[PDB]
């Protein structure tokens, strides 16, 4: 728990990126 | 594999989804709406099914949109059309009457008279004689909003 | 001597709202960049489109009453030529059956589940004509032209289930048919817009909520006069005896 | 690259399975058109599944 | 009933098309 190895640093998180909804259609007009 | 950058030790990803916010129509509050969804909502046409088979001693079926909706609804004058065997009829007069025949499987000639209330959406249908066996009798209306502006669906 | 009779056509309604309040929006703008009021003013302008698409189908598949059966699995020897010829031999067979109910002429088309897709799919070149730079979807989409005639739609199956989970029944083997009306007078399925979709705003409440609302009128609904004859449904089975299945790989059960 | 692919090995659910011996008396068209209808199920079905 | 809300104006009907019967005849003369 000390500064001299990698253990010692806390993290932080990082956004990275974001999902949107996906489209939405249909196709039926030729009836 | 698929190539991402990595600049930090953790990293998060987040996603969005579309959600019904009312339980109007097909949908209950919290379903999930995508590509493949179906379902009536927002549509103010519909139909229903009365009977699902008709036995052969009944004689009279009721319509009250309390057991299909939640709640007494409006219904618009002069919309409301009724199926027998998937066969469409006339439309209801503006004054809450409506007329319809129909022919037996034997060959009889059978009448079916209805009546309406259009306050709360309540249909009597009184058949002259007892249909046959296995039918089925769904009806169509449509549903008034400026009667009742708080039904309107959201998301 | 002759006699008259007439026929009227009237249009529906549809409505759609969405709701926000300001310190959600705050908080989605500072947290994420995020933008409440255009996601759902998209959200809604795209279902509105969505849901009317998907009625069209739905009262097409409920209001048809007429039935035929084929059996589609490929005999252990026969070439894809003789099997070929036959199906087209079925289907013209079916599509003449339509034009005499209904006495007029007119385009063609189908609506075929996922199975039955790939079944046609599995024809020659010169019987089925692929769409140029087809790509699968899981939306419903179209993949090409048989007999240089029939424009066939593919469902997948997730739709499927879901109609069939609502009470309209229509299998993954299912496959509906429908001829396309171009005289003035006559047509199968009648759709326009009456009044297009009208986009309102209602500013901040006392209650700090923010709203929209979209309202608009259109028709969809089938043809008073023979509008149901336009269309038949077909349902396939693999069930011949010395048959091939093609998703095992051997007889279909000896 | 080969711990890729050993994670890529042991890390799949979803099985399926099929036969490739010829049958007696086809040709190679016939084989070829089914087998590739097989595979374009099983793209489907993944495609279907992921739904992208 | 007044104008202001949707019932209460008159609906005015409108004329489409016209339809006449399909023409007659078949083809037996060969034999």
């Known amino acids: 728990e000390m500064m001299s190895v990698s253990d010692g640093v806390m993290r932080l998180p990082l956004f990275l990126a974001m999902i949107l909804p996906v489209q939405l259609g249909a196709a039926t007009a030729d009836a | 594999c698929t190539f991402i950058p990595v600049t ?31 379902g009536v909502y927002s549509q103010l046409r519909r139909r229903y099914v009365l009977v699902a088979s008709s036995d052969g001693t009944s004689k009279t079926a009721t319509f009250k949109m309390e057991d299909f909706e939640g709640q007494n609804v409006p219904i618009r004058k002069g919309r409301t059309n009724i199926y027998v065997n998937r066969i469409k009829s006339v439309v209801d007069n503006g ?16 009448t079916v008279t209805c009546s309406l209330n259009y306050n709360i959406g309540q249909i009597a249908l009184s058949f002259s004689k007892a249909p046959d066996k296995g039918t089925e009798i769904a009806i169509e209306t449509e549903i008034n909003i400026e009667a009742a502006p708080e039904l309107i669906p959201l998301i | 001597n002759h006699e008259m009779k007439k026929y009227t056509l ?8 969405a709701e926000h309040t300001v310190q959600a929006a705050y908080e989605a703008q500072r947290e994420f960049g995020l933008d409440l009021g255009s996601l759902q003013f998209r959200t809604l302008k795209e279902y509105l489109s969505h849901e009317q698409d998907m009625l069209r189908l739905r009262i097409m598949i409920w209001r048809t009453l007429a039935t035929d059966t084929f059996d589609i699995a490929l005999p252990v020897n026969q070439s894809f030529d003789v099997w070929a010829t036959i199906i087209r031999g079925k289907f013209q067979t079916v599509y003449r059956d339509i034009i005499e109910r209904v006495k007029s002429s007119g385009a063609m088309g189908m609506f075929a589940g996922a199975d039955a897709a790939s079944f046609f799919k599995q024809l020659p070149k010169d019987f089925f004509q692929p769409a140029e730079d087809y790509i699968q979807t899981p939306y419903v989409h179209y993949i090409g032209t048989l007999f240089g005639n029939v424009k066939v739609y593919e469902v997948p199956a997730g739709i499927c289930k879901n109609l069939t989970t609502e009470n309209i029944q229509f299998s993954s083997m299912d496959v509906l048919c429908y001829v396309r009306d171009e005289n003035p007078g006559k047509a199968g399925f009648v759709t326009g817009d009456a009044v297009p979709a009208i986009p309102f705003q209602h500013p901040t409440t006392p209650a700090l909520v923010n709203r929209t609302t979209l309202w608009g009128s ?12 336009y269309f038949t449904r077909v349902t396939l089975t693999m069930a011949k005896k010395g048959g091939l299945n093609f998703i095992s790989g051997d007889t279909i059960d000896a």
Chains 1, 5 share one sequence.
């Open chain 3, 218 to 229: 259109a028709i969809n609904d089938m043809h008073p006069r023979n509008g149901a004859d």
């Open chain 2, 8 to 38: 930090r030790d953790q990293s998060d990803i987040y996603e969005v989804f579309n959600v019904a916010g009312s339980s109007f129509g097909s949908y209950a509050a919290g379903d999930v709406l995508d590509m493949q969804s179906v």
């Open chain 2, 95 to 110: 004054s809450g009457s409506l007329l319809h025949s129909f022919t037996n499987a034997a060959g009889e000639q059978i």
């Open chain 3, 10 to 17: 009237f249009p529906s309604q549809f409505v759609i709202a």
